[PDB]
Amino acid sequence: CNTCPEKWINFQRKCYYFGKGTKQWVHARYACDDMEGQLVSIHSPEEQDFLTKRASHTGSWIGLRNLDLKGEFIWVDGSHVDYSNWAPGEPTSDCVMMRGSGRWNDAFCDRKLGAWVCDRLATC
Ligand SMILES: [Ca+2]
């Protein structure tokens, strides 16, 4: 399965949308939902590398958040963290962003970032 909607990019069995324009995290979450995807989940180094190659230099929202501040970071699709790419010292805790390096930072959810990444399953 490697088919994606127009404007989305395939990697492996998924499709990705590199969104641009100011969003706080929840607004990015809904922006992805409006296009029938979700804020991206990341489950391998190879997926991460694909994303880093396209990462906004001024940071991007991804689909990880410290749910109900129950203290566990969980992906928006409900999957759990098995792969991680935290920047040194992170998480400091919120909502998670990807730096230009691809590394992750937990941040205030009301922070305004210029980019955000969505995913969905590729069709076959
Ligand atoms: Ca942090």
Swiss-Prot record:
Classify the source by domain of life: Eukaryota
The positions annotated for binding Ca(2+) are E90, T92, N105, D106
Q: What is this protein called?
A: Low affinity immunoglobulin epsilon Fc receptor soluble form
Please list the disulfide bridges: C1-C124, C4-C15, C32-C118, C95-C109
Q: Which residue intervals define the domain C-type lectin in the entry? A: 3-120
